[PDB]
Symmetry: C3
Amino acid sequence: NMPMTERIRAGKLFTDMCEGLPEKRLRGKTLMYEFNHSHPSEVEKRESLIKEMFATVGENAWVEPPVYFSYGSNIHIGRNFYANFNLTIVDDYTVTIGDNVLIAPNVTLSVTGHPVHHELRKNGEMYSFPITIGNNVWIGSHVVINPGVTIGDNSVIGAGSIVTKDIPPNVVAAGVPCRVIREINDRDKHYYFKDYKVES
Amino acid sequence: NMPMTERIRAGKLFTDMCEGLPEKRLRGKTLMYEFNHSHPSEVEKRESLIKEMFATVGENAWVEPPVYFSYGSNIHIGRNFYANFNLTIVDDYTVTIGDNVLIAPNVTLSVTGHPVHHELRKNGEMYSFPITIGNNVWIGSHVVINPGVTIGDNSVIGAGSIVTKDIPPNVVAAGVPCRVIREINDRDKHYYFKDYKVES
Amino acid sequence: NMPMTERIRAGKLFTDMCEGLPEKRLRGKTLMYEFNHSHPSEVEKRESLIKEMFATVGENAWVEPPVYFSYGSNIHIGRNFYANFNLTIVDDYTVTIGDNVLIAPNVTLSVTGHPVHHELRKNGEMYSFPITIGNNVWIGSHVVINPGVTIGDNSVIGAGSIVTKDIPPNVVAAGVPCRVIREINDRDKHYYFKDYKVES
Ligand SMILES: CC(=O)SCCNC(=O)CCNC(=O)[C@H](O)C(C)(C)COP(=O)(O)OP(=O)(O)OC[C@H]1O[C@@H](n2cnc3c(N)ncnc32)[C@H](O)[C@@H]1OP(=O)(O)O
Ligand SMILES: CC(=O)SCCNC(=O)CCNC(=O)[C@H](O)C(C)(C)COP(=O)(O)OP(=O)(O)OC[C@H]1O[C@@H](n2cnc3c(N)ncnc32)[C@H](O)[C@@H]1OP(=O)(O)O
Ligand SMILES: CC(=O)SCCNC(=O)CCNC(=O)[C@H](O)C(C)(C)COP(=O)(O)OP(=O)(O)OC[C@H]1O[C@@H](n2cnc3c(N)ncnc32)[C@H](O)[C@@H]1OP(=O)(O)O
C-alpha cells in the first residue's frame, strides 16, 4: 500500500495501470500523434506542440518528427535542443537534457528497466531511474541510454553506443557497453574530423 | 521441381513475386497502415486490428504503434505480450513468441536473410528460418534477432544485442554478437537493479 | 570563411540556415511526408514520389515506407534498389548507392557529423563527407554508416555494425566498430547460411 507514483520516485518496483497514469499517457500520446502526423509545412503547429508535449523546453528547440515517449511531461529539455528523426524517450520518470544538445537519428533513452528474474516481473513490473544529459552533449545514431545514467557535459557518445554507466564530462565514449574512448584535448580544436584541419 | 511456397518451408532460397505472396503482403501492410496511423484513442479498433494482423494472439496483448512486418500472418504470439514502439518483424516465415514476453523499443526480428555471395542473390534471393522466443523473455532496446534463432524461456537479452546464435533458457545474454553473460540465479529473486532488494 | 554551399563541397564546417537550404529541405520533407503517409494500395503514387524524392533512381527501385532523409535530392540510386522499413539518410551532401543494393530494415546513413569539441559546434556546426555504396552490397539491420565511408562492391555488412571506416570489396564486415570478418570465397557459392548447401 504505497501509491505507484511514490514507488517510482523511490526506485521501487511498480506498475502503471492506475492512479491517473493511463490518463496522463493518453494526453501526452495524443499530442505526440498530432505532432508525428503533422505536415512539414505546419511549422507554428509543430512549434507549439513541442512547448506543449514536454514539461520543459528552452528556446530554439527543434525535433524532427517522429518522436516517441510514454508521457512527455517528464522530459525537461534545455536551450537550443536539436533532435533528429525517431528520438524515443521512455520517460516514466525524470529525463533531463541540458543546453545545446544535439541528438542524431534513432536514439533511445529509457529510465525504465525490468527485473531480470522473470518472477519479479510476472505482471511486467518495472523500476525507473532518471537520466541526465549534460550541456553541449552530442549523441550519435542508434545510441541507447539506460536507466539512471548521467552523461557529463560537453561529452560525445558514438553511434551504436549502449550507455549503461555514467559518462564523465569532456570525453568521447563508444562501444557496447559504452566506454570512455578518450578525453577531448586541444587537438580537437584543430582537427574536426579524421584528417581534416580546421584551417584549410 | 518445387514452388517458392515449398522452398520457404524447406529452408531453400526463394523470391516472393509470385504465388500470391505479394498479394498476401498487401493485405497485411494494409491493416498495418491502419494500425500505425490510428489515433491513440481508437483503443477498441487497435485491439481488433491486432487479432486481425497476426496469425495468433493470446489474451492481453499490447503493441505500441508503429509496428512493421512483412505479412503479419506468420507471427504467432502467446498471452500477456507487450511490445513497445517500433517493433519490426520480418516474417517471410513463421515467428513464434511465448507468454509474458516483453519487448523494449526499436527491436528488429528477422527470419529472413540473403546469401552472402552476391552471385546467389542476383535477383535478391533469400532464405527463411523461423524464430522461436521462449516464455517470460525480456528483450532490450535496439536488439536484432537473426534467422532461425531460438531464445530459451526466462532469458534476458540486453539492449543492442545482435543475436545470431540460440540463447539457452534462464540466462542473461548481451553483446555484439550476443554472448551468454551469466545464469539467472536466486540472487536475482531479491535484487533487480544494482543493489536494490525487495521486502515483504 | 566562404559561402556555405561551398564549405559543404570542400568538407568544411558549416551551418545550414541560409542560401535556400531550409526551403530545399521543406520540399524534401514534403514529398517525404506524402510518401510516408501514402496508403499501401497507392502503388502508382509511391512510384512517382520515389522518382521525385531522390536525385537519381535507376529502374526497379523499391523503398518500403517510412523513409527518412534531410533533403532527398542529394541521393543517387542505381538500379534494383531495395530498402526495407525505416531507412534514414542524412543527405546533407551526396550519397551514392550502386546497383542491386539490398537494405534491411532500420539502417541509418549519415554523411554528416559534428566537431567533437563543443567550442567547434556552439551553433551546431557540422561537416559532410559523401558516402559511396558499391554494387550488390547488402547491409544488415540496425547498421549505421558514418560520414565519408565507401562500401566496396559485393560486400556485406552484418546486422548492427557501426561502419566508421571504408570497407573493401568482396568482404563480410560486422561489429562495433565494423571490421572485416573474412573475404567472400567460393565456399559461399554453395553454403548460403549457417550449414545449408544449394544441391544435396
Ligand atoms: C545531430 C544529427 O542528427 S547529425 C550527426 C549524425 N552523426 C552520426 O551519427 C555520426 C556519429 N559519429 C561517430 O559516432 C564517430 O564514430 C565518432 C565521432 C564518435 C568518432 O570518434 P573520434 O574520436 O572522432 O574517432 P577516432 O578516429 O579517434 O576513433 C578511435 C577509435 O574509436 C573507434 N570508434 C569511433 N567511433 C566509434 C563508435 N561509434 N563505436 C565504436 N568504436 C568507435 C574507432 O573505430 C577507432 O578504432 P581504433 O581505436 O581501433 O583505431
Ligand atoms: C521493454 C520496454 O519497452 S521498456 C525497458 C527497455 N529497456 C532496455 O532495453 C534496457 C536493457 N537493460 C540492459 O541491457 C541492462 O544492462 C541489463 C538488463 C543487461 C543489466 O545487466 P545485468 O545482467 O543485470 O548485470 P550488470 O548490470 O551488472 O552488467 C554487468 C556487465 O555487463 C555489461 N552490460 C550491461 N548491459 C549490457 C548490454 N546491453 N550489452 C553489453 N554489456 C552490457 C555491464 O556494462 C557490465 O560491465 P562489466 O562486466 O565491466 O562490469
Ligand atoms: C534486405 C532485407 O530486408 S533482408 C533482412 C535483413 N537481414 C539481417 O539483418 C540478417 C543479418 N545477418 C547477419 O548479420 C549474419 O550474422 C551474417 C549474414 C553476417 C552471417 O555472417 P557469415 O558471413 O555468414 O559468417 P558467420 O556466421 O560464420 O560469422 C562468423 C563470426 O562472425 C560473427 N558475426 C556474424 N554476424 C555478425 C554480426 N552481424 N555482428 C557481429 N558479429 C557477427 C559471428 O558471431 C561469428 O562469431 P565467432 O567467429 O566468434 O564464432
